[PDB]
Design a binder for this molecule. Structure first.
Ligand SMILES: CCN(CC)CCNC(=O)c1ccccc1S
Length: 184
């Protein structure tokens, strides 16, 4: 019993491509910390992201500075989750409440213990699994992370709970409309 939104997305995009070039000639790579699974679900279905106001300025500057020299990749993790949940490529500058276009590439859970040994010299040598939102990963360590994420034989992903997130979204909209209506 697959959800029609997810079947449409899977037919229109090649998630988790078996051929992905982790050994980047160029590009910049940033950590994205999401506040919830629900935000990841929206990002995948609508191909957009919003960071904080400071986070949006950092990402906007990197995208415009990259000027299509190469990609800007985003490594997603929800706060407190203990795994990374995928990778998207940033696909537009920030549009202003800033949003920007993203293209999701990997959708798969990679547990933190697979990436913990990789430390970020530009962030007091802490593990990449201990980053804040829009932490930049140096190029050579980004290749190592992308190599691990790309080849990891995942057992699950947010797609396994897709219908649950769809139902939560639809219920929340109705709850809000009714509340707004009682406020009249
Ligand atoms: C309450 C947190 N959250 C629930 C879905 C709403 C705020 N989050 C967004 O509105 C958003 C989510 C994904 C991609 C872009 C945006 S702008």
């Amino acid at each position: 019993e697959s959800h029609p939104v997810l079947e449409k997305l899977k037919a229109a995009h090649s998630y988790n491509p078996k051929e992905f070039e982790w050994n980047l000639k160029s590009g910049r790579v940033f950590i994205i910390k999401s506040y919830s699974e629900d935000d990841i679900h929206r990002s995948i279905k609508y191909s957009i992201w919003c960071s904080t106001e400071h986070g949006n300025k950092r990402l906007d500057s990197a995208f415009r500075c990259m000027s299509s020299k190469g990609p800007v990749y985003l490594l997603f993790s929800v706060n407190g989750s203990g795994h990374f949940c995928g990778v998207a490529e940033m696909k537009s500058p920030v549009d202003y409440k800033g949003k920007f276009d993203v293209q999701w590439i990997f959708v798969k859970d990679v547990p933190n213990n697979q990436l913990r040994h990789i430390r970020l010299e530009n962030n007091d040598n802490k593990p990449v699994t201990n980053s804040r939102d829009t932490q930049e990963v140096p190029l050579e360590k980004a290749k190592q992370v992308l190599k691990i994420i790309s080849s990891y034989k995942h057992t699950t992903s947010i797609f396994d709970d897709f219908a649950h997130y769809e139902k939560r979204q639809a219920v929340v909209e109705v709850v809000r409309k009714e509340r707004q209506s009682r406020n009249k």
